[PDB]
């Protein structure tokens, strides 16, 4: 089973790289299976995306390189959680749509947040039975029209710090836009060419 799986995978990779001459190597950050399905549906119309084992990738593009030259210069660059998107379209048309269809990922517990966000002073809009998280975090909230109101601006998160469980559940219930990330292009490959 495993050997047949790997052999079929090798055949798929070699036929795909022979069929499609233009491919962008793209890094995968902390992305979900729902995002994978969404990207698959949104991209399967015009191009294809490939995201598997890096050892498989290097072995396929190295051992069977004899069919076409000008390929070994990808080898010292394919590292990390990366894959290949194969397209017959052009760089701008792929890049703008792939940079636009970024799902707003939430604040998962245990995830680093290089970006910075800050909650403003606005009504929560939820019932006044969730003051426990605010009081545990140290947030001054008072009753107003049967809703919870943030009377003062407070520092929520800084850059490059761990997110606690209380902060994560607060950002989950707040229904706001937290720091988000997705599938980001590392570099390109158009018939033997490396750019941004």
């Amino acid at each position: 089973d495993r050997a047949t799986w790997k052999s079929n995978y090798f055949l798929k990779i070699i036929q795909l790289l022979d069929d499609y001459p233009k491919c962008f190597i793209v890094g995968a950050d902390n992305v979900g299976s729902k995002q994978m399905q969404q990207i698959r549906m949104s991209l399967r119309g015009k191009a294809v995306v490939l995201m598997g084992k890096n050892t498989m990738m290097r072995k396929a593009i190295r051992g069977h390189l004899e069919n076409n030259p000008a390929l070994e210069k990808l080898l010292p660059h394919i590292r990390g959680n990366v894959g290949f998107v194969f397209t017959k379209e052009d760089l701008t048309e792929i890049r703008d749509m792939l940079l636009a269809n970024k799902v707003p990922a939430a604040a998962r517990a245990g995830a680093i947040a290089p970006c910075e966000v800050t909650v403003p002073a606005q009504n929560t809009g939820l019932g006044p039975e969730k003051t426990s998280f605010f009081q545990a975090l140290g947030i001054t909230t008072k009753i107003s029209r049967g809703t919870i109101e943030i009377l003062s601006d407070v520092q929520l998160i800084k850059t490059g710090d761990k997110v606690g469980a209380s902060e994560a559940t607060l950002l989950n219930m707040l229904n706001i836009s937290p720091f988000s990330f997705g599938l980001v292009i590392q570099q390109v490959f158009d018939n033997g060419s490396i750019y941004n």
Binding site: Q37, R40, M41, R44
Partner: protein
């Protein structure tokens, strides 16, 4: 959102139930339907199907309309009271039909063995209606 929304699903069907059903337990979430709401929801939800009938409702602030997603087992148990290939071929036309698909045959392959509750020889060697739907 009109100060209240009815996104929540239900898992009741067949018998009317009403008081025996958990609809009064959902009730305090919105306070709008109550008994005069769940009775009139069940009035249109008596059939399609006659089973548990997981379905969504939409509120017009006075009355509720009900839409039943085309669940495979739900619709096949509604159909049931043999191959019957054509009814399962046509039952998937009006569904969401996403199923992480890549071809039309995936949906019928899914439902052929969703009917296994043998409908597996077709799954093994099927050679009909691959591009029938598109």
């Amino acid at each position: 959102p009109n100060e209240i929304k009815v996104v929540y699903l239900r898992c009741t069907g067949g018998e009317v139930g009403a008081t025996s059903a958990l609809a009064p337990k959902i009730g305090p979430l919105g306070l709008s339907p109550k008994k005069v709401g769940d009775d009139i929801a069940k009035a249109t939800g008596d059939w399609k199907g006659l089973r548990i009938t997981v379905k969504l409702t939409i509120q017009n602030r006075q009355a509720q309309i009900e839409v039943v997603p085309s669940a495979s087992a739900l619709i096949i148990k509604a159909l049931k009271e043999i191959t019957f290939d054509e009814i399962v071929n046509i039952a998937r036309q009006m569904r969401h039909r996403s199923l992480a698909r890549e071809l039309s045959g995936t949906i019928k392959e899914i439902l052929g063995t969703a009917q296994s509750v043998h409908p597996h020889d077709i799954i093994d060697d099927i050679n009909s209606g691959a591009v029938e739907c598109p």
